[PDB]
């Protein structure tokens, strides 16, 4: 029940820590070759408690690489995601992001990936839909997931489809493996 | 299988997780009568994802007890406790910058009171999975005087191999429970 | 002595930095006909605030290098070099979890190609400051083959309290150059 514990250490956490903590994240993220050469990096909206992505997308504007958010029938395709004023409304779930854009994986050069509990060793609890479980056996490029240590555990229900996200950054440190 | 399992426990935990953890590990063992008491301890210089034993070592002296460190013979399975005085550059030994130096007139078992033993793995029952070269094993088994161990929780085990000969530590000090298999 | 400096400023350095100059001094390591033509390799199983080693055994060993460890004996400055062969459990080791399993099979050290030699203080010169069992010191003398020592830049003083005795190291190497020794 490692979703659950997990539901709860976040749950502690106050809004002025989760967005300390974000920030420090955001640095090392940021501070990777994996960021600075990437010239399109796919990643999602975050939600409730998921982590904050909201300042990685516009960082991403910011220093003109492009963006692709998903769009997922276990099958999910990534599609770009033209810059918009409005990108607050719609982390405000109060509007869609809105295509003969069917962004292949080889296009893009930095994937951050969602999760609800993560291994020291990549691996990862899904929020139940199986694609990003699936997406990455189709994906060969650099992989990484920005995480509260609160998300971080010894081990991780392994299945034998599952595939181990490269890089594990979190608030306190960032982690290798596979 | 072990030895790794708890080393991606031991590495899944945050820097704060252990810093609190040990520390109420440590108010623990400086609350028991064996450490009020003791009068002259043996202990290891911790390293890498061991369990901290800077602050047990620092608190020693704080209270003017002894305190002996290890000197293992790379030799045989043979090891022997030397006095340890009191270093102001403890700070540098715990960093790997500095060894450890009255290597003259060993501590004899007997002359120990308390020994907080070391280890990898431990089961409930105060059996343990050494780092190797079972220097521990034989030296316990020539020793009478009081063990705990100082552990977290992801370090212990519903059983350990224990093969015979083998004598399992008095004490278990964790994040939580206090085992005291006798 | 002033080894205190080099501890405040090695503690001090980016956790996340260290990662970044190491890795330049390995570029710098693996790309030199001392270490590419080298077959067996010295070195040890580094800790808390030295230099990481552990990229270096794996790198000779993925090159199909044979490596050596010491197992230095207590209460004298013997030092003996002994095969260690291909761990899989190498994170085990340097976490600390596990001594390296080596049984002896002594290698004499004209048998060491390249030596890379720890230490916590250096000079431009390739004198170094050890870290007090003086096992080094002694080793050194009596070799004759390369030496090289990878260090940062806070480790490297423009001098060394130097003594009439033992010879410096032949290539110092740090995160920003290369220092040849002569």
């Given at each position: 029940?490692?979703?659950?514990?997990?539901?709860?250490?976040?749950?502690?956490?106050?809004?002025?820590?989760?967005?300390?903590?974000?920030?420090?994240?955001?640095?090392?993220?940021?501070?990777?070759?994996?960021?600075?050469?990437?010239?399109?990096?796919?990643?999602?909206?975050?939600?409730?408690?998921?982590?904050?992505?909201?300042?990685?997308?516009e960082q991403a504007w910011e220093e003109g690489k492009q963006?692709?958010?998903?769009?997922?029938?276990?099958?999910?395709?990534?599609?770009?995601?033209?810059?918009?004023?409005?990108?607050?409304?719609?982390?405000?779930?109060?509007?869609?992001?809105?295509?003969?854009?069917?962004?292949?994986?080889?296009?893009?050069?930095?994937?951050?990936?969602?999760?609800?509990?993560?291994?020291?060793?990549?691996?990862?609890?899904?929020?139940?839909?199986?694609?990003?479980?699936?997406?990455?056996?189709?994906?060969?490029?650099?992989?990484?997931?920005?995480?509260?240590?609160?998300?971080?555990?010894?081990?991780?229900?392994?299945?034998?489809?599952?595939?181990?996200?490269?890089?594990?950054?979190?608030?306190?440190?960032?982690?290798?493996?596979?």
């Amino acid at each position: 029940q490692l979703r659950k514990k997990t539901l709860e250490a976040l749950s502690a956490l106050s809004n002025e820590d989760i967005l300390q903590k974000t920030e420090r994240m955001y640095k090392y993220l940021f501070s990777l070759p994996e960021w600075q050469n990437a010239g399109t990096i796919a990643v999602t909206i975050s939600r409730g408690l998921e982590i904050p992505t909201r300042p990685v997308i516009e960082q991403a504007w910011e220093e003109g690489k492009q963006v692709c958010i998903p769009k997922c029938t276990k099958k999910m395709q990534f599609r770009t995601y033209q810059t918009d004023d409005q990108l607050e409304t719609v982390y405000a779930g109060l509007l869609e992001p809105v295509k003969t854009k069917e962004v292949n994986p080889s296009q893009i050069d930095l994937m951050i990936v969602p999760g609800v509990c993560f291994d020291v060793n990549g691996f990862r609890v899904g929020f139940g839909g199986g694609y990003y479980d699936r997406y990455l056996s189709e994906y060969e490029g650099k992989t990484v997931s920005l995480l509260l240590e609160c998300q971080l555990f010894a081990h991780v229900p392994r299945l034998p489809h599952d595939i181990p996200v490269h890089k594990l950054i979190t608030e306190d440190r960032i982690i290798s493996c596979f």
